[PDB]
Write a protein that binds this ligand. Structure first.
Ligand SMILES: CC1(C)O[C@@H]2[C@@H](CO[C@@]3(COS(N)(=O)=O)OC(C)(C)O[C@@H]23)O1
Ligand SMILES: [Zn+2]
Length: 259
């Protein structure tokens, strides 16, 4: 590759050359990529997709959050884990990060019936393997964020932290908060979509079991705008961080299922 990967917005907003998504190397040009559009009525119900069990999601922690130049990322350090959800094993939580724009009708990586949401939050987990790498080594939990006028109090520790990490490779410590503070009510997480795909940044490894929850997180417009207002892609602060979103990939021969 002849330069570092970037999102489209970065190449459009700066004169410094970088590799846009359609030009990404690694496995990014293979045929089981993510994100995708999900046609909700065409996803077949699979009875074996039961409720998720969250561990360590309720416990208050002071999380480390950092700007890695592509997004903001909470380091979960195996301090939380998941099971159920039609998953073959329990999975350990590694990180939480987001993708967003500054318009209410875009910012999500996945789309539901052709609608993008204002943001998409990803909680990345790793498989507890046995003896006997796989297509489902990583489980990413995806939550869509809808913009409105409801102040989401649970997001406030994260939103306030953002001022402190404007430039890449900066780290800060969030005020006391839980993962559940960031999510819809647990009982509303029974309905989700499931498919097999890839990581959405290079090298786009095809090792992800995806879950996209039907229920949106409600965040105030100004809490969403805090992300593009407070963060930058570069140490020079010439390009505000937003549209950190990979364009949609074809489902191809794959199947999307739902609980
Ligand atoms: C903050 C951001 C965007 O997310 C981090 C890191 C590199 O890319 C990721 C993307 O994970 S994803 N979007 O497929 O859930 O892939 C890994 C390596 C799992 O870490 C993710 O930058
Ligand atoms: Zn992501």
């Amino acid at each position: 590759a002849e330069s570092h990967w970037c999102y489209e917005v970065q190449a459009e907003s700066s004169n410094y050359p970088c590799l846009v998504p359609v030009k990404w190397g690694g496995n990014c040009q293979k045929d089981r990529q993510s994100p995708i559009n999900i046609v909700t009525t065409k996803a077949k119900v699979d009875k074996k997709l039961g409720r998720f069990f969250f561990s360590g999601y309720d416990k208050k922690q002071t999380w480390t959050v950092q700007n890695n130049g592509h997004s903001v990322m909470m380091l979960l350090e195996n301090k939380a884990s998941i099971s159920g959800g039609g998953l073959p094993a329990p999975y350990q939580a590694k990180q939480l990060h987001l993708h967003w724009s500054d318009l209410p009708y875009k910012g999500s990586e996945h789309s539901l019936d052709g609608e993008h949401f204002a943001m998409e939050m990803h909680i990345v987990h790793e498989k507890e393997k046995g003896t006997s790498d796989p297509e489902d080594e990583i489980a990413v939990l995806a939550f869509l964020v809808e913009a409105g006028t409801q102040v989401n109090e649970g997001f406030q520790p994260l939103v306030e932290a953002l001022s402190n990490i404007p430039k890449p490779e900066m780290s800060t410590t969030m005020a006391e908060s839980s993962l559940l503070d960031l999510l819809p009510k647990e009982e509303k997480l029974r309905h989700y979509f499931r498919y097999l795909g890839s990581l959405t940044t290079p090298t786009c490894d095809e090792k992800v079991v995806w879950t996209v929850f039907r229920e949106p997180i409600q965040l105030h417009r100004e809490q969403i705008l805090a992300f593009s207002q407070k963060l930058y892609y570069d140490k020079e602060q010439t390009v505000s961080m937003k549209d950190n979103v990979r364009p949609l990939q074809q489902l191809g021969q794959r199947t999307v299922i739902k609980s």
